[PDB]
Design a protein around this ligand. Structure first.
Ligand SMILES: CC(C)CCC[C@@H](C)[C@H]1CC[C@H]2[C@@H]3CC=C4C[C@@H](O)CC[C@]4(C)[C@H]3CC[C@]12C
Ligand SMILES: CC(C)CCC[C@@H](C)[C@H]1CC[C@H]2[C@@H]3CC=C4C[C@@H](O)CC[C@]4(C)[C@H]3CC[C@]12C
Ligand SMILES: CC(C)CCC[C@@H](C)[C@H]1CC[C@H]2[C@@H]3CC=C4C[C@@H](O)CC[C@]4(C)[C@H]3CC[C@]12C
Ligand SMILES: CC(C)CCC[C@@H](C)[C@H]1CC[C@H]2[C@@H]3CC=C4C[C@@H](O)CC[C@]4(C)[C@H]3CC[C@]12C
Ligand SMILES: CC(C)CCC[C@@H](C)[C@H]1CC[C@H]2[C@@H]3CC=C4C[C@@H](O)CC[C@]4(C)[C@H]3CC[C@]12C
Ligand SMILES: CC(C)CCC[C@@H](C)[C@H]1CC[C@H]2[C@@H]3CC=C4C[C@@H](O)CC[C@]4(C)[C@H]3CC[C@]12C
Ligand SMILES: *[C@@H]1O[C@H](CO)[C@@H](O)[C@H](O)[C@H]1NC(C)=O
Lengths: 8, 349, 310, 338, 56
């Protein structure tokens, strides 16, 4: 699925 | 933990709760240091603010001032007799010479009632032209400005059934050798006006007691530019008040304290500048020589120019011994003093 | 290490992001440490923490300092084409470190806004209440409330294995088309992080603006209308225009997750823009020492005293 | 004729100086040259009493050497227990402007005064509930700067009208007036036998008064600026004066001369308080640079420094038994050292 | 003025007749007292912590 890899 | 240690902590805990309540209630207090010149109407200035700030006077409270009323009439007249000897003005009537000795004999403290032999003594001297001429020269020697008021009201003061009117109360002065405080409760904050004009000791010993004050109130009379006092080497009173103003500002204690500069007796300046000139007492003055508003602004500028800091704010007001806005001006100047201090600590200003 | 597939794995993988972004992170880290740490010295040594203002200004400097601490970790994670070599326990902490401190930085600025409003618009009545104890209670409640907002981050954040590219990333997984719990993270940043804090900041500085106009016109004595009013406009607008790009793209990512947005042509820009908007959200942390510090006269003279002691 | 009297006074002053110049064989420094130095003095703050809201201006130890009373300008008179740091009494004063405080030797009374020109006596024991004001000693015309309990019914006060007085608390009227000074009297110290007492004034002179006869016996004139503190040597034949000159000077009653001067080039701040040790070897002095100094009273060399106050140290006392020293400062905190 | 002068010369002539002993005799008595009571001074010679009423 959506992989949100950002710091914040 | 013995039995005794229990009661010791019970007593200690009761005290710590009381100290917490007093610490909470002390946040509502503000200390203002009041510094009168001396000739200024400092007494009538404070009493006026108490009348306008509610309160009032009652017959019980009034009867206390009755003894002071009579005492003031003697002092008033006695100072006139002493000047006769100095200004070398003799009496028009020979009868007054004897009457003058009686007035010198009177002891102000011993006075407790006004008796017939003293009524005449004082009435007769007021009638004498020499004394009236000495009264007219009231600038040369320290004399009450309210003598005419009471001496024209001598008939009611003389009567045994006498009650001072609110106006008599306002003018009468109570002597003080120590600090007296006047609390004004404006609901939001209670002001503690600390009057230290009558300490009569070295100032360096007790000046540090007011290191954290919010503001300093200076009461100066505008009608002192021609009142050369003969006790010293014929020195102008305005110069002495300026020296006192300059000295107080330069103290390192009041580096964080604002200054409220009340200028008193502006109505008397208007009446007296008609026949008196400011340029011959202060050569730096350059005005119409007949305007009462040009002199006011010039006198104010001399006092403000004495401040070297350029960061200490000086608030100025003109009082005419009957202004009803004195307490409201102090609230506005103190509120504005707190606001600027808040801005500085927030790094906004 | 759980094994999953990335829905569209080419989003945000550009050459100019793997070099420019780690440079910005390092630059902000150097500047932010130099600035914020300087402020903490001044408040403890010269202001001496005798006033409520000191308590709030110290916490704001502390929150910005701690947010920058874990920045080098994300700088090298982005440098190596998004590969996490630090292990699960480190991504658990590093994700929480950024979210916790950033939430506290925003919440503290709201507290300064309300606290400044009381001390300026009501200088007389606030003296009874604005005591040191109330400052301590407010500060600890702020940090506790930031921890509860940052808690979903420390829970969902986890290391994953991307079978599509054989790359170990640590991130949040939106496995469901609804996935209500992870999207509560998205809306909390949007509502509890921008709207409510900005409405309070806007309201308080607007009422401060009116009061200073009335106060300066009544006295009319040597007023410095320029400096006080420039700072209020600078403070309010800088907060808005340094946080609004990130909150816009956070909202878009919420729409992507729900299913409203499905095309990867614009899921590519969203993952491309997000590193940029995080860089300029840290501008607050590296510039707060200026706006809330040295724009006043007191800190300027304190720094000159430090300069003399070299 | 005025010139004849002042010339006679000048001749008498010349005779006074000549007599001293004669009985000046050797200085105290020369006699104590071959003596063992005290060394370094290490004192640590055993206690720290908190509870005052504003600056502390005076403290006085009880005779039992465990209870001490302190005065602050917040309007509180607090009695502490040194051992357990428990407050025994918290008296609210009518005027918050207080500059002095005293503790009765019997332990039943305390006294205080200040810019109100009045000395108030508070009864501690036998008064159920709140302690009440037993007496209002009035009659001074300046701020009251020191008071010391001679007995339970006799207190000696010094004021800013350049005069000292001896009061009878029961009657309320002053019994004797000691007026020879030409400046503000700032300090007052009683002899161990309570038959003599020295006073320091702002005219940079100290005088020895006889309590019963009420006359000035000797005048000591070594200081340049104003004297802030004074204290008897335990033997009773000497006393030490601290002044704004940043120097402490020792005087001897029988020699009628200044013996030694305790000064340092670094010290430029005024001296606020002074006290002696039980043996008289250590002379403690509080300063305006926020710390106290301990001096070897026989060699005039510094032996220690009592730091730990961040504002001016205003008061300083040593217990009767010599166990502890209590210093209070404008930081609103008292500290007991050992 | 004149009255104050009369009092001052009276005080100065009254102050003159007090015989003054030599400093060496006086200075010796200061040393004699300090040595006799040196042991009893607790601040001069630190007391063992067992018999210290402060800090146990
Ligand atoms: C912070 C505000 C001003 C937005 C800044 C956006 C900047 C940092 C981003 C957005 C668009 C990005 C550009 C997009 C495309 C390229 C092409 C590449 O071959 C060189 C880098 C370059 C030129 C990027 C440089 C950085 C860039 C300009
Ligand atoms: C990195 C930033 C955010 C924090 C550190 C900023 C410091 C280094 C900068 C910002 C404000 C600058 C000050 C601005 C104004 C003056 C006034 C001048 O008469 C002396 C230098 C002084 C005091 C500058 C010193 C350096 C200064 C304090
Ligand atoms: C449990 C964690 C995740 C959230 C709560 C953190 C709390 C307990 C910690 C973190 C920040 C700390 C604050 C940091 C700075 C100050 C100001 C200083 O004068 C001491 C009190 C105070 C206010 C501290 C109180 C305790 C504090 C608020
Ligand atoms: C947008 C929001 C989340 C920012 C933070 C606002 C809240 C958390 C802050 C702003 C106002 C702060 C309050 C200010 C005053 C007090 C009074 C004190 O006696 C208890 C704490 C309390 C009640 C603080 C609690 C935390 C508080 C309510
Ligand atoms: C986050 C990036 C875009 C930086 C944005 C900074 C902007 C929003 C801030 C920083 C400097 C601030 C300016 C500082 C000074 C003034 C002068 C005043 O008379 C009008 C407002 C104005 C012009 C402020 C407007 C807002 C401002 C321009
Ligand atoms: C300076 C403040 C006020 C606004 C900054 C907006 C910046 C952070 C945001 C807004 C729009 C974003 C852009 C949106 C779309 C793209 C397309 C992509 O292929 C390169 C990055 C780029 C160009 C983003 C760069 C960052 C960006 C420019
Ligand atoms: C990843 O690993 C698998 C084996 O597990 C291999 O077949 C594949 O080629 C590798 N690379 C990619 C891009 O899948």
């Amino acid at each position: 699925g959506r992989v949100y890899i950002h710091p914040f | 933990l013995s039995e005794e240690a229990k009661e010791a902590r019970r007593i200690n805990d009761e005290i710590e709760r009381q100290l917490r309540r007093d610490k909470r209630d002390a946040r509502r207090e503000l200390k203002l240091l009041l510094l009168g010149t001396g000739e200024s109407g400092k007494s009538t200035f404070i009493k006026q603010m108490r009348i306008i700030h509610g309160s009032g006077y009652s017959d019980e409270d009034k009867r206390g001032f009755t003894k002071l009323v009579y005492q003031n009439i003697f002092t008033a007249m006695q100072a006139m007799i002493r000047a006769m000897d100095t200004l070398k003005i003799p009496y028009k009537y020979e009868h007054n010479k004897a009457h003058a000795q009686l007035v010198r004999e009177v002891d102000v403290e011993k006075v407790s009632a006004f008796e017939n032999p003293y009524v005449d003594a004082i009435k007769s001297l007021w009638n004498d032209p020499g004394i009236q001429e000495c009264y007219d020269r009231r600038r040369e020697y320290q004399l009450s400005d309210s003598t005419k008021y009471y001496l024209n009201d001598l008939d009611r003061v003389a009567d045994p059934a006498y009650l001072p009117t609110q106006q008599d109360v306002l003018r009468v002065q109570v002597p003080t050798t120590g600090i007296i405080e006047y609390p004004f409760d404006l609901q939001s904050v209670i002001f503690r006006m600390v009057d230290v004009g009558g300490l009569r000791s070295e100032r360096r010993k007790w000046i540090h007691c007011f290191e954290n004050v919010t503001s300093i109130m200076f009461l100066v009379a505008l009608s002192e530019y021609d009142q050369v006092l003969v006790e010293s080497d014929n020195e102008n009173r305005m110069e002495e008040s300026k020296a006192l103003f300059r000295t107080i500002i330069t103290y390192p204690w009041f580096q964080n304290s604002s200054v409220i500069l009340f200028l008193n007796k502006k109505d008397l300046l208007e009446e007296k500048i008609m026949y008196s000139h400011l340029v011959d007492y202060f050569p730096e003055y350059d005005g119409p020589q007949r305007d009462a508003q040009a002199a006011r602004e010039f006198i104010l500028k001399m006092f403000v120019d004495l401040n070297p800091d350029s960061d200490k704010i000086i608030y100025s007001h003109f009082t005419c011994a009957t202004d009803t806005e004195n307490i409201r001006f102090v609230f506005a100047a103190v509120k504005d003093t707190i606001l600027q201090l808040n801005l500085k600590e927030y790094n906004l200003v | 290490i759980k094994r999953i597939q990335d829905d569209c794995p080419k989003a945000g993988r550009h050459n100019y992001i793997f070099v420019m972004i780690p440079t910005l992170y390092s630059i902000i880290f150097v500047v932010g440490i130099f600035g914020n740490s300087l402020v903490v010295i001044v408040i403890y040594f010269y202001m001496k923490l005798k006033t409520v203002a000191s308590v709030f200004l110290l916490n704001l400097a502390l929150a910005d300092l701690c947010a920058l601490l874990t920045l080098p970790l994300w700088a090298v994670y982005t440098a190596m084409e998004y590969r996490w070599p630090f292990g699960n326990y480190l991504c658990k902490i590093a994700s929480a470190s950024v979210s916790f401190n950033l939430y506290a930085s925003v919440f503290l600025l709201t507290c300064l806004s309300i606290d400044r409003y009381l001390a300026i618009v009501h200088p007389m009545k606030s003296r009874l209440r604005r005591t040191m104890l109330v400052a301590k209670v407010t500060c600890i409640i702020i940090w506790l409330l930031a921890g509860l907002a940052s808690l979903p981050a420390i829970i969902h954040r986890n290391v994953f294995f991307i079978e599509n590219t054989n790359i170990t990333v640590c991130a949040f997984h939106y496995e469901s088309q609804n996935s209500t719990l992870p999207i509560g993270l998205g809306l909390t940043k949007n509502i509890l992080g921008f709207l409510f804090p900005f409405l309070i900041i806007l309201t308080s500085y607007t009422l401060i603006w009116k009061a200073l106009k009335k106060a300066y016109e009544i006295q009319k004595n040597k007023p410095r209308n320029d400096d006080i009013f420039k700072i209020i406009m600078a403070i309010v607008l800088f907060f808005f225009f340094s946080w609004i790009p990130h909150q816009i793209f956070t909202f878009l990512d919420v729409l992507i997750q729900l299913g409203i947005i499905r095309d990867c042509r614009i899921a590519d820009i969203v993952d491309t823009a997000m590193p940029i908007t995080i860089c300029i959200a840290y501008f607050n942390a590296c510039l707060n020492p200026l706006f809330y510090g040295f724009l006043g006269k007191k800190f300027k003279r304190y720094f000159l005293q430090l300069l003399k002691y070299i | 004729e005025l010139d004849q009297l002042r010339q006679e006074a000048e001749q008498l002053k010349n005779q006074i100086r000549d007599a001293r110049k004669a009985c000046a064989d050797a200085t105290l420094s020369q006699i104590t040259n071959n003596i063992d130095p005290v060394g370094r003095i290490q004192m640590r703050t055993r206690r720290t009493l908190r509870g005052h809201l504003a600056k502390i201006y005076a403290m006085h130890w009880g005779t039992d050497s465990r209870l001490l009373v302190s005065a602050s300008q917040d309007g509180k008179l607090i009695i502490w227990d040194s051992y357990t740091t428990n407050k025994v009494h918290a008296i609210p004063l009518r005027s918050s402007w207080v500059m002095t405080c005293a503790y009765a030797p019997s332990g039943n009374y305390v006294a205080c005064g200040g810019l109100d020109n009045i000395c108030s006596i508070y009864n501690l024991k036998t008064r159920e509930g709140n302690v009440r004001v037993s007496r209002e000693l009035a009659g001074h015309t300046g701020y009251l700067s020191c008071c010391r309990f001679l007995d339970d019914n006799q207190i000696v006060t010094s004021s800013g009208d350049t005069t000292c007085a001896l009061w009878d608390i029961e009657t309320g009227q002053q019994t004797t007036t000691f007026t020879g000074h030409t400046g503000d009297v700032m300090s007052l110290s009683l002899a161990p036998d309570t038959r003599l007492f020295v006073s320091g004034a702002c005219d940079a002179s100290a005088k020895l008064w006889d309590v019963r006869e009420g006359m000035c016996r000797q005048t000591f004139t070594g200081h340049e600026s104003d004297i802030n503190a004074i204290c008897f040597f335990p033997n009773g034949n000497a006393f030490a004066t601290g002044s704004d000159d940043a120097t402490c000077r020792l005087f001897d009653l029988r020699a009628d001369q200044e013996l030694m001067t305790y000064s340092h080039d670094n010290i430029i701040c005024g001296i606020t308080s002074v006290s002696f040790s039980k043996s008289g070897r250590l002379l403690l002095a509080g300063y305006d640079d926020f710390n106290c100094n301990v001096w070897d009273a026989l060699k005039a060399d510094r032996a220690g420094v009592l730091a730990g106050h961040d504002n001016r140290v205003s008061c300083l006392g040593v217990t009767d038994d010599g166990m502890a020293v209590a210093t209070g400062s404008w930081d609103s905190f008292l500290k007991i050292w050992n | 003025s004149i009255a104050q002068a009369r009092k001052l010369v009276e005080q100065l002539k009254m102050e003159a007749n007090i015989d003054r002993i030599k400093v060496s005799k006086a200075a010796a008595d200061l040393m004699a007292y300090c040595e006799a009571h040196a042991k009893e001074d607790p601040l001069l010679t630190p007391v063992p912590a067992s018999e210290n009423p402060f800090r146990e």
